[PDB]
Amino acid sequence: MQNAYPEITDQHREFLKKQGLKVYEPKPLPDQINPFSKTYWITNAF
Amino acid sequence: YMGNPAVQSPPKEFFNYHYVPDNYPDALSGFRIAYRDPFEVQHVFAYENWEYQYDGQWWSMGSLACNVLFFCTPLFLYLILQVEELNSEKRGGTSNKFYHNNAGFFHFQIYDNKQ
Amino acid sequence: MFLNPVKDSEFDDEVKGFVPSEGEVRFVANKNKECGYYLQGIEQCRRKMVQLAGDSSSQFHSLGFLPCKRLVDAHYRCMTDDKFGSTIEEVPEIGLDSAQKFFDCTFQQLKPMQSCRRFFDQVVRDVYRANG
């Protein structure tokens, strides 16, 4: 699959980082939400 | 035709419930059978026994235009389907055709050989 | 099956699909409905000759599948409409490789006759494309 969006330059990305902006990235599930976590299974046992 | 608002005496001769000989009765909830209302039973067994009196009565009874439209409804449906077939043919869409694109193989049918 | 290798490719086995002509499809279908007896005969002959002379101690083991050679030649003549020789050895050079593949897949790697039909029809299609 292709990128589907108009490409931007690394100089533009550096400029945006200079202006205080942050690149959006997905965040991992917390231990409570993650169904493969000791916290999840301790909650289940409780 | 419509019901008569006038008060009428209860019917003396009306179709009633009849059971097969040697019928095992329904004994649910203590086997309590109440006497049936004559007017209610008459309405129960009225439509099933209603008949037309003379030839052609079915046309003019009620609304002649509505009866004609109801009678011609299958023809109207077929003609509308023909118009839609014209539209699909002009546009190469799904037609009213028996699409034999599987060459006879059935839907998820097992096709295995015996040794 | 109906794929041609891409001559200039970024990877080893990139292929591109193609569709045969309606004339080729009609010809192959008609001949297969007219010459399908020979193909079933080749299958049954292969099985019977393996039953008879398959054992190495048999007298006819050295003859191999030669009794089915007549069936193969008859199938070739029927599929080619008696215009490209009386034997499959007289096949045009375009269908030579496909004929070799058919013979291998029919008598050396005794595959089910579906693959053998694929290769024989490939021979017929090559001949048809050469001499449409």
Binding site: A4 | - | D12, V19, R117
Partner: protein, 175 residues
């Protein structure tokens, strides 16, 4: 043995191949089979029963694959609706996504339609597209186990083949 039904039409039949003239009303079962019942009833009559079963399965998978294309483009549009505000969504969508959406439209994909009306050439093209995808995923042995059933020895041999192929492709000059 296949038979036939007696015909009632009084129409002459002329065969150039056999140089014979026949009447439709007077035909035996074999003559009806070779003259009246000689037409085709499937997209690829040149294929065997097994080959056309494979062709039909690949055609169904291809229709579902085009529907999968449309569903994926819809999911990416939904993703754009969330990750991109409306102030600039339509520009980025008209960049590349809108063209693909219109490419995967009512005639080009079956969608919810009862029958995808394809000619035999179109069905063959769809099946060839499916076969190209199958070839490019099987050269790397990706079919097992989602799209293929292979024994343990077959899996090991395929792994060795894919390893050799990967080494050869990695050690090729860039274009």
């Amino acid at each position: 043995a296949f038979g036939g039904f007696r015909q009632t039409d009084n129409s002459l039949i002329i065969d150039d191949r056999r140089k014979i003239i026949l009447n439709t009303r007077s035909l035996n079962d074999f003559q009806q089979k070779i003259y009246l019942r000689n037409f085709f009833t499937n997209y690829r009559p040149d294929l065997s029963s097994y080959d056309y079963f494979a062709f039909k399965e690949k055609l169904r998978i291809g229709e579902l694959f085009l529907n999968e294309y449309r569903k994926r483009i819809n999911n990416e549009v939904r993703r754009a609706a969330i990750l991109t505000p409306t102030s600039s969504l339509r520009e980025k969508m008209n960049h590349k996504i809108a063209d693909q959406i219109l490419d995967l439209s009512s005639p080009h994909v079956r969608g919810a339609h009862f029958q995808a009306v394809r000619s035999w050439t179109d069905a063959s093209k769809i099946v060839n597209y499916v076969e190209e995808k199958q070839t490019k995923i099987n050269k790397y042995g990706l079919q097992f186990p989602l799209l293929g059933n292979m024994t343990e020895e077959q899996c090991a041999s395929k792994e060795d083949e894919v390893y050799q192929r990967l080494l050869k492709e990695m050690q090729k000059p860039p274009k």
